């Protein structure tokens, strides 16, 4: 039954009686404003706009605001939509909380993975460094070969080369919920989710059991 949007906000530890530290990702979920339920409005199916929040009244755009203008003239900070099949719904001014998961198990999350700028090689593709002695001919952090002599006359498509990390999401599927607290905005999930503290996270039930 649908999914929710929130923010990573940090890494934390579970304090288990197994003595291990065990990471848990906080995931802070303000109640999603559910500003529209659709009735056959495109492609012959039913959907709901979940709406992550609102925007500051001094920094609003007209083509964004019209998507939420019946609920408020302050946009939504997330124009996310989900399929409606497990229920029948109508549009009201009551936001949905993490209580949506109080009887649910096993979830998947879309994050905002590691922004590293340049990323390089040793921290992009786990490359190794070449022999640093017998005299080194400007060849300490170099890949070795990138291909083979003359016959291909090209590098292969999908070769590992240096290139940035950032402007990416990543989706992680080995997660389950711990806190589900609709009074603390606290979802809390088992393990470490992609991205830094400011990463915006989308969560739904996983099809892998």
């Amino acid at each position: 039954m649908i999914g929710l949007v929130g923010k990573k906000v940090g890494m934390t530890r579970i304090f288990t009686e197994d003595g291990v530290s065990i990471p848990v990702t906080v995931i802070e979920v303000e109640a999603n404003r559910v500003t529209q339920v659709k009735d056959l409005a495109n492609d012959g199916y039913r959907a709901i706009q979940v709406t992550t929040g609102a925007k500051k009244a001094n920094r609003v755009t007209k083509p964004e605001a019209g998507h939420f203008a019946k609920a408020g003239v302050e946009a939504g900070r997330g124009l996310w939509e989900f399929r409606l099949a497990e229920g029948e719904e109508f549009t009201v001014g009551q936001s949905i909380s993490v209580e949506l998961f109080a009887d649910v198990k096993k979830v998947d999350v879309t994050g905002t993975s590691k922004g590293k700028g340049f990323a390089g090689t040793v921290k992009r593709w786990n490359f190794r460094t070449q022999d640093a002695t017998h005299g080194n001919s400007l060849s300490h952090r170099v890949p070795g070969s990138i291909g083979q002599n003359q016959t291909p006359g090209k590098v292969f498509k999908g070769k590992k080369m240096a290139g940035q990390m950032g402007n990416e999401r990543v989706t992680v599927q080995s997660l389950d919920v711990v806190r589900v607290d609709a009074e603390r905005n606290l979802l809390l999930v088992k393990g470490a989710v992609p991205g830094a503290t400011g990463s915006d996270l989308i969560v739904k039930p996983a099809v892998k059991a």
């Binding site: 288990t16 197994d18 003595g19 291990v20 530290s21």
Partner: protein
Amino acid sequence: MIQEQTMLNVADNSGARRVMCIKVLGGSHRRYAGVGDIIKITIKEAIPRGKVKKGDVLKAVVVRTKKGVRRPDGSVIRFDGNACVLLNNNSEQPIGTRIFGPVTRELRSEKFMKIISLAPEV
């Protein structure tokens, strides 16, 4: 780490005290050995009063390391150096009649029965 050419202390009686690691056992492409794991070890000085000879290669279990353990109790436990127990070349389990210093209990395989039962370690 407990890796190649590492010099070690033997937790076994009557022979010599110094022994050297040459490789890690069990699984593919193996580097480094943890506490409760198996290595192949050389008898570096032997002494004529022990049950093994100099330059022979035996099997041993890692029981102590200077970085020690951090997964079973979750908090780090560290030793003063590095030691292993020395197994009988055919019958397995420890070759001597005494084992020196504290010993692991984290390994579960019944081929180590008489060292995973040691009450002084719990």
